[model samples]
Target: VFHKIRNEDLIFNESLGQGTFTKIFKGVRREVGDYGQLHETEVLLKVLDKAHRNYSESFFEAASMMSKLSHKHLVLNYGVCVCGDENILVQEFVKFGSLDTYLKKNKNCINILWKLEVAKQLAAAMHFLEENTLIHGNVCAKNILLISEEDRKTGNPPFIKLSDPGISITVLPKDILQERIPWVPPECIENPKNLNLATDKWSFGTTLWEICSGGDKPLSALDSQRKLQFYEDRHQLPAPKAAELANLINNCMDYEPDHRPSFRAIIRDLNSLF
Candidate 1:
């Protein structure tokens, strides 16, 4: 069962961000105490875009599944609210924003060990998703959120939470496809609608590249989609400075789907870094 929030119950604040099919707003709820058990709570309101509303059933199902996901590295879905034709998803808010922006903002201070930890955390989340036989569909730096903390008392390093998982291929808008083309695998580009674990591994490699390079765009020089596709087909990948990290990225981005390492293997390799 999910919570049904009235439009009046939500008080919208600043825009947190936006995804392919939703606009995320920082909000407060006037009323609470349900599945979320939130009162005077800070929440992220994800309002489904009107253009993509035709896939409301798919979105609802995904949201429901997301709410049940309990991994520490995955973002929490509080609940969903359906008001007439509008479909809104309420989620736990991560204070530090997306990993891409966060890295770029703090690049001068961030160290290699910290980046390695981020990779390990993501691997754990991916392993969980693989065990469940679910594909994240979208995996990139922008989709990774950092949990903000002011105090330094705890020994735990900075953490990340993956957002916008399980977006159905049926609802993937063209703009998103275009925006994420660089991170997408060659096989996926050949068959735009075919997304699975293999493609996810490829995207994960791209994400690793992004992190290792301190937020550099994957294949930044190639602006043309045709050229990017050509480069991918030719097996050209972004180079990482560390040999172990490079090897992981290479294995993840293998042209042959079967050649790519499973998330379990990836996790093992990441753990060895510690």
Candidate 2:
């Protein structure tokens, strides 16, 4: 049965998060196996559900793509579980919760300095991806996690880790279209078929605004229709009180997706401000 993993001698632990299609968990093993056990590990379990038929191949594609990426800012890949109808994706657990939690609660420890560092780390990660001509496809507060440097005691600055790579079906080459969350670009809303790095750039920009505003919603607090109007009117959410921080965000939220700054440009501006 699916419990085969437990009998295999892997000590999987508590729940991490439950997504629309997956549940993440933690696990550990004192010793190694032929493929190696996840020691002090964080693993994400993506359940294969009825939605699988929509883009099951996309899931496999993402797992394959992740194995090729090697970056400290990116989450570590462990192993995978392909148990018939149950498709489980096992990856490193990120202890610091998603950016959404930190932003919404206004966790005071996450001050402007912390936000800037997160931005830098994001830029660095994106730059690394760009080097290989790979686009993150989706970059949002919910997908980024904060890790305390205290755990490592390396004296290096604290950092943010990016998660959920290659999961956007629309971003996959020659894939069918799908409606994503609201943060996606205007063009994507109009035509999901054309989604690309520019759409991700738009999302990154909005995410910056969220970080600056202590995780406030990017559109006006108005109703959905009014929110869309404001967005179309170029009256999207303003940045946090820090104008310097705000500028970086403004560049990303440019009305025209094409005009939004690239990850490289974002990194340069952030370096200047921080």
Candidate 3:
């Protein structure tokens, strides 16, 4: 079940980014307006670069499922373009890019209040997925998109969309390494199969660390192997600039997965911080 967009209707322009099997572009879609006149709207186009020559069922299935999700804090997928040889998924165009980029670019100017707001937005999105019986699987700052920088400049919480790889199939399977590893808990690192609902709490904790810090890489804290063995110790995870959020970050990144808070509980804690 897909909306089934036509190839001719999509006008691909700037090449946004690409990896081994995926390419994204900033593009325009020609759609009829309410007045029956054609209008061009900005949209992001995600195309599959590698797969079986005839394509696989997995790709289509993921695309269809992503299109069905409708959430304010999650990127909206308009549909997929299965016109001819193309396998492109259309999503809302976010000009501001990822929160990680935003943090790095504006680290000097971003206030603590706005950072708290960003944290709350991400938790809210995960809470929505948690309610729908969905596991985000990955919840790093790089995967979370930032929208409307100007709004944040004016003292409003900048809109954020968790560009989850779970629904997008962007990172693919079996490539579960460092792009997301820093955010994962030790248990998940030891036995990735430990990646369940509770695993997100650990991941969310590290992401909060990134938010607390100036969007620096979380890689340095762990050893060179990128694996940590905590002998029932606190392990002294890095602290955030906002001293008040220190405990909340610690709880999310506890050595025991069960100790991590749920998204609802995490949101409640974050709201109080503001």
Candidate 4:
């Protein structure tokens, strides 16, 4: 059973962010006991777009799946709250925002070792997902969030958490798919409905590339679906500076889905790098 929060108990603070199907708000929650005493706690409130019927169902299902996943590298889902027609998910609140913004702003300041650690942490999370026969579906810098401010300031590779896992492609809008085409695998692009471990591996490679290149776009100039497929057929990828890291990225981004390394294998390779 999940903890159900009442509408009056949640006090919305500010907009944390918004995704294609959900909007996240940083809020304070007031819990009432039998004695009628109130205890406040900070949380990230993820509200689904009720206008989209598919999103509501997806949000609840995703919340159910995420409730079972608990790891240091994966963001924690506290509970779900259905108040009136609004469907909301309560989650752990990380101080810093997405890894995409962090990398973009602090690229010059972050060293290679820290970047490698970030990749390793993400790989570990992915490995856990694979072991459970689950796919993240969408894995990218934006979904990787920083949870530790101390580590960030010390240049010791900030503690990160993988967010927004287990969303089905069927629920996603076409515009969201188009925006994420660059990180998506060639096979997935061809078959928009397909999503699995292999596609996750491809996205992982793009993520690692982003970390290594200080948030450089994968296949940067090619925007259109036709051009993306053309480049995929030609096997074009952004070159990595480090040879060892380059090799791993190349393997993960292989045109043939079967050729990509498993998340477990990726974890081993990343550990070897340390």
TM-score per model over all chains: 0.87, 0.80, 0.84, 0.87
Ranking by lDDT: 4, 1, 3, 2
Q: Which residue window of length 10 is worst by lDDT in model 3?
A: 166-175
Q: Write the per-residue lDDT of candidate 1 for residues 86-202, one digit (tens) a residue.
A: 788888888888899887888888778888889988888888988888777778998899996323597678889998654565366654565566676666666766677887898
**CA shift of 240, model 3, Å:** 2.5
* lDDT for 248 (candidate 4): 85
Span of 10 residues, lowest total lDDT, candidate 1: 166-175
lDDT for model 2, on a 0 to 1 scale? 0.64
Q: Per-residue alpha-carbon lDDT of model 2 for 104-219, expressed as tens digits?
A: 77556556677788878888887787677776666778788877542336655567888764446464332122223346666765566656767767778777876777776655
Off by over 4 Å in 3: 51-63, 150-155, 166-175, 220-224, 228-236
Instruction: List clashing residue pairs in candidate 1.
Output: none
- Across 162-242, the per-residue lDDT of candidate 4 in tens digits comes to 887535665666655666766777777667667778888989998888888776666667667765665456675657664
Q: What overall lDDT goes with each candidate model?
A: 0.77, 0.64, 0.72, 0.77
lDDT of 3 by residue, 51-144 (tens): 6334445445545554567888888777777557766778788879878778989988887887888888888888887787776666788778
Off by more than 4 A, model 2: 1-12, 29-40, 50-53, 149-155, 165-182, 220-227
